[PDB]
Design a protein around this ligand. Sequence first.
Ligand SMILES: *[C@@H]1O[C@H](CO)[C@@H](O[C@@H]2O[C@H](CO)[C@@H](O[C@@H]3O[C@H](CO)[C@@H](O)[C@H](O)[C@@H]3O)[C@H](O)[C@H]2NC(C)=O)[C@H](O)[C@H]1NC(C)=O
Ligand SMILES: *[C@@H]1O[C@H](CO)[C@@H](O[C@@H]2O[C@H](CO)[C@@H](O)[C@H](O)[C@H]2NC(C)=O)[C@H](O)[C@H]1NC(C)=O
Ligand SMILES: *[C@@H]1O[C@H](CO)[C@@H](O[C@@H]2O[C@H](CO)[C@@H](O)[C@H](O)[C@H]2NC(C)=O)[C@H](O)[C@H]1NC(C)=O
Ligand SMILES: *[C@@H]1O[C@H](CO)[C@@H](O)[C@H](O)[C@H]1NC(C)=O
Ligand SMILES: [Ca+2]
Ligand SMILES: [Ca+2]
Ligand SMILES: [Ca+2]
Ligand SMILES: [Ca+2]
Ligand SMILES: [Ca+2]
Ligand SMILES: [Ca+2]
Ligand SMILES: [Ca+2]
Ligand SMILES: [Ca+2]
Lengths: 737, 94
Amino acid sequence: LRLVDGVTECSGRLEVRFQGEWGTICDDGWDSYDAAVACKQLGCPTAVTAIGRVNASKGFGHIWLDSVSCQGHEPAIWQCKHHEWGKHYCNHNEDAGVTCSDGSDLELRLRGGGSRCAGTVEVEIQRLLGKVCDRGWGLKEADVVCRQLGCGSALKTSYQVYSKIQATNTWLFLSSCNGNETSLWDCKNWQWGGLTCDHYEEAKITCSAHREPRLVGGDIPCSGRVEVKHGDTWGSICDSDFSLEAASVLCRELQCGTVVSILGGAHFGEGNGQIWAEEFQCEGHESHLSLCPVAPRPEGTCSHSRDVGVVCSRYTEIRLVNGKTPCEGRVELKTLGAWGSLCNSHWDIEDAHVLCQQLKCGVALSTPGGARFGKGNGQIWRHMFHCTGTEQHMGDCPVTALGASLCPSEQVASVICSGNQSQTQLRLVNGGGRCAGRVEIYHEGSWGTICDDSWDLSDAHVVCRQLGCGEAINATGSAHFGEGTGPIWLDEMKCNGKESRIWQCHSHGWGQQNCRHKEDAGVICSEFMSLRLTSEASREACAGRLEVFYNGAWGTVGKSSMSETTVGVVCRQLGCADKGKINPASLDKAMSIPMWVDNVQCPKGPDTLWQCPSSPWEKRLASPSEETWITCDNKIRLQEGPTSCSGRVEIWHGGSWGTVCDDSWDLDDAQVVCQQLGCGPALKAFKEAEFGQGTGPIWLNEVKCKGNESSLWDCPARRWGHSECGHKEDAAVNCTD
Amino acid sequence: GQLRLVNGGGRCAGRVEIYHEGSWGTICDDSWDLSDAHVVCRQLGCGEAINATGSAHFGEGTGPIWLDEMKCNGKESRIWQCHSHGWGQQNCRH
Ligand SMILES: *[C@@H]1O[C@H](CO)[C@@H](O[C@@H]2O[C@H](CO)[C@@H](O[C@@H]3O[C@H](CO)[C@@H](O)[C@H](O)[C@@H]3O)[C@H](O)[C@H]2NC(C)=O)[C@H](O)[C@H]1NC(C)=O
Ligand SMILES: *[C@@H]1O[C@H](CO)[C@@H](O[C@@H]2O[C@H](CO)[C@@H](O)[C@H](O)[C@H]2NC(C)=O)[C@H](O)[C@H]1NC(C)=O
Ligand SMILES: *[C@@H]1O[C@H](CO)[C@@H](O[C@@H]2O[C@H](CO)[C@@H](O)[C@H](O)[C@H]2NC(C)=O)[C@H](O)[C@H]1NC(C)=O
Ligand SMILES: *[C@@H]1O[C@H](CO)[C@@H](O)[C@H](O)[C@H]1NC(C)=O
Ligand SMILES: [Ca+2]
Ligand SMILES: [Ca+2]
Ligand SMILES: [Ca+2]
Ligand SMILES: [Ca+2]
Ligand SMILES: [Ca+2]
Ligand SMILES: [Ca+2]
Ligand SMILES: [Ca+2]
Ligand SMILES: [Ca+2]
């Protein structure tokens, strides 16, 4: 037995001698055990044994064996089962070969991509280059390939072409891999060399640690400065290189839910280290940042005073603390920087389901009451979740803490859930809230409405009782909240008002109706909430007296201990700006509406005032000096300019600051901007980001101000909320001081 | 290795297109100045450049964008001889 025409003395085409002459062996039936016995027979290492002839040429003469089967026990090849000598039909393009190695000389890399863990799969076996064949290439094999290199799960069979890759002749053919072994070399029956990859492409792969994201520096679970890892090294991101879609993808990968806001500057503290120069181009629907396209720049980057930060929805920090097992005990959550136990008063089983689905262990069995699992360490939090049971995290549930009633002495929430992780209706729509809108009922695997015939407050009481919304204030019909689509399930509802569920009423029966969709029913319940700033000029202005809607009536909110964060939440909820200032009461005209709530303290997470803890609702008559008046900061600002009111234009919307593209930017729009800021006539309207690149998303494009509008949103704009623009074309203005 | 002008009403005016990687593509207008236009005109034998235009003055193109950030010094013989971010390295739109 001999090996010829190979890289070393331990690899090459295999030859056998008979009658005095050497001859070749056919590769059919030649498996890894045959190569193992061939390596063992010769004086060569046998730790790793592979099939195939490496860079060897075609055979010559007779083929003296075919379709052997050694099974690995027989010391020598000819002791195995084999066919008739010389009498076989293989041509000289099918000659066998063997590749024996110690196992410390085999190494595979990824080349052509943006990091260690994205590219074409290049293989180094005994200092000979190669590639892996597309034939049979799938994510299940890519998983072991990127497990051996030290990266995460494979995600795609492609990559971005960062650099060109040289050509190679050999090829590596891979059989099916079980998907759990810790190296590609451990896959069964992999061939090195021999066969050609005709009608097939090279193996490509992209895996998780290509662009792995992270959030650092925040005081709440799902907010902070954004950092990304390019395989091995971490780096911050410029606020001008990150978009709203990229933020959505980032917070989807990290399990933080939907994006609440992008924050520029260095909101969460300046970082240290590398700043990347890649502009993301996510379409929004990706699952990992690694899958997004990116545009690198060879030039320099921003300063560290422009690191992007993100705030996302899942800001609730909830846990089970005291109990026999880590998946049962008292429930605690931290807000306003302090831990506290929840209130049982409006805590039910559907909430426990999401509590222990968040913690990834089973489903809830019961909700023990009282001090059975421990008393609170101090003050009790009065938050009331309204989970529907189908969401995987508490931050996805509707929450309310504004005006919640004070709890009794020792009613504290607790939960017990099973360990088996494998364990796995009315809705109000179009009402501007959760406890108001058109009523839809889910009975036969589809959502349907209810007729307004015989529809009165008596049935609306049942509707607002089953959903967790208190009592009924309005029982509307005639499709007040818009026409529905789907079945009309119920008619002639005759609830007595004390029922607990809607179907317990003496209706005519499912599908027994004579209605159209213009007769869909709706409700407005007592727990409906709305916020308003009132002034004489307009009832929905951006500066005036603050009012809240509750129990069907409008009232005012006291100014006691009103912090900056609370006014920020108010302004952001109303859509005015990111922050505002309290004022002494105006003197134009004050209606005598009562006051609803006071002592409102908002944490840093929520973007609605309904989630801020406060004292319980209490209607009182109080002096106008105790009223809350707010002026929200301007919705448009000019930044980085040499004076107060010249520079780059930025606009607040959707919880984030952004910029205006310059595709149709002109002096007529600069007039509007300067007038809005209260500055003299416009002089120049710039283009192509004269005063530097912007922050956040591009909120506007092709604005069409006529030159006399009172604000930019009075102007027409064919684009609003989405733009085919980059940050390199931000608009700026120069006005008279 | 071919350079072409399209939609300009003549062979010595219009949108610039480069044939590479088996397809026609465009050049971004970022830093597109009179010197790069001079190089194009010299390559096509059309003399000295008079206008260098951007913002798709001759109409939005189709196909990939091949070169951004052209920094020709004005004396180059062929356009691809200039400094640039490389084939396909772009952050532009049509
Ligand atoms: C397929 O691959 C093997 C592995 O490289 C090839 O074997 C190598 O062939 C080259 C010729 O290109 C030999 O180079 C020569 O080496 C001697 C050393 O004394 C020197 O005198 C010559 O000037 C020349 O450099 C090389 O020795 C040989 N072996 C190794 C270990 O590199 C093989 O030829 C390829 N083809 C086939 C059909 O197997
Ligand atoms: C909800 O019901 C209230 C009354 O409980 C309605 O308020 C009245 O609205 C009418 C106009 O339709 C006014 O003339 C009255 O002054 C309002 N108050 C009272 C006490 O009658 C309210 O309009 C209803 N809302 C909806 C959406 O149906
Ligand atoms: C090509 O450049 C010339 C300048 O060399 C431009 O001609 C000027 O255009 C402006 C704007 O309409 C006029 O005010 C000037 O009077 C024109 N002449 C000169 C000598 O400045 C010409 O418009 C440019 N063409 C294009 C298509 O961009
Ligand atoms: C704005 O315009 C005034 C008046 O022309 C000029 O003095 C000033 O330098 C301009 N500012 C900038 C930043 O160009
Ligand atoms: Ca009716
Ligand atoms: Ca009724
Ligand atoms: Ca009816
Ligand atoms: Ca532009
Ligand atoms: Ca305009
Ligand atoms: Ca440009
Ligand atoms: Ca240039
Ligand atoms: Ca560019």
